[PDB]
Design a protein around this ligand. Structure first.
Ligand SMILES: Nc1ncnc2c1ncn2[C@@H]1O[C@H](COP(=O)(O)OP(=O)(O)O)[C@@H](O)[C@H]1O
Ligand SMILES: Nc1ncnc2c1ncn2[C@@H]1O[C@H](COP(=O)(O)OP(=O)(O)O)[C@@H](O)[C@H]1O
Ligand SMILES: Nc1ncnc2c1ncn2[C@@H]1O[C@H](COP(=O)(O)OP(=O)(O)O)[C@@H](O)[C@H]1O
Lengths: 100, 101, 100
């Protein structure tokens, strides 16, 4: 299981969500953050997208976020992939990919 | 060492904290986030993100405590994810590994 | 690759940034968070710094954040190091350390 963490330009959230929804992703968690980088504004507002995804889906998810969030201009952001050891759905107690 | 990350309904935070304190967990970090899921709002709902680093010998009990504390049985209760922490340091003391917690 | 996640006192952000800049660390992602701990006010505002860094630099980064963020008073916070499986720069498709 993977935690896909994307830092993107805020106006790209909707496009990112449509791309994810089309892939059948059932949900995601979004934070407002401050991004320091080479893009000239010493920071710009960014949006952090965190979505837990199965091993069989994570590569397509990364690709879809990348395509949807890309403008070709400096500041577009990063996608980091971290591994998730265990996952639980709080409501049902389902685990692993059933928790997603 | 584990980073236990829980996305919960905001009104469950106090119970979650009390459950963690009851297990001797000395602290935790909390963020306000927007949760997109099946629960209806209007696309997202406010959620709380709880991040707590815990030792290997405590993490299972922590995950259970959070699950029980944050459960309502209604849609939108959220998720708990367990990530592995390679190293940890307490800034004030330089303590590392479980001593950092 | 490592994700270095530091939870620090808000007034230490500038010191932490400048220390990282000295290491040629380009960017970083900053979040406003609430910290529950032994420090007495409930919670206190903290700053979460997330910086992805190469294996050959992460220890120096951890040291630099620790030295910069330390006051010796309760509430200074924590640094956690998590391993990053993959990383992509959205703008270019660059991966691994080139993504940083
Ligand atoms: N080493 C890093 N670790 C974590 N986040 C980073 C790092 N470098 C950049 N970022 C995030 O990526 C955003 C964009 O970086 P920037 O250099 O401006 O554009 P690009 O990603 O196109 O190079 C930053 O605002 C910051 O939030
Ligand atoms: N794949 C995912 N990755 C990360 N967070 C998610 C994911 N799916 C859902 N969430 C988070 O969990 C919350 C609850 O989702 P929801 O489908 O409404 O209810 P339930 O958790 O009961 O299935 C969402 O608002 C969102 O914050
Ligand atoms: N187990 C934990 N997991 C995640 N964050 C923690 C944990 N314990 C403490 N923190 C964070 O560290 C901050 C400082 O903790 P505190 O006990 O007040 O001081 P010190 O870090 O100097 O021991 C807290 O406000 C909280 O953000």
């Amino acid at each position: 299981m993977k935690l896909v963490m994307a830092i993107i330009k805020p106006f790209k959230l909707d496009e990112v969500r449509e791309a994810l929804t089309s892939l059948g992703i059932q949900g995601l968690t979004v934070s407002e953050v401050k991004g320091f980088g080479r893009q000239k504004g010493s920071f710009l507002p960014k949006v952090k997208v965190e979505v837990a995804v199965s091993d069989d889906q994570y590569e397509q998810v990364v690709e879809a976020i990348q395509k949807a969030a890309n403008t070709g201009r400096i500041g577009d952001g990063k996608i980091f992939v971290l591994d998730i050891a265990q996952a639980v759905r709080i409501r049902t107690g389902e685990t692993n990919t059933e928790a997603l």
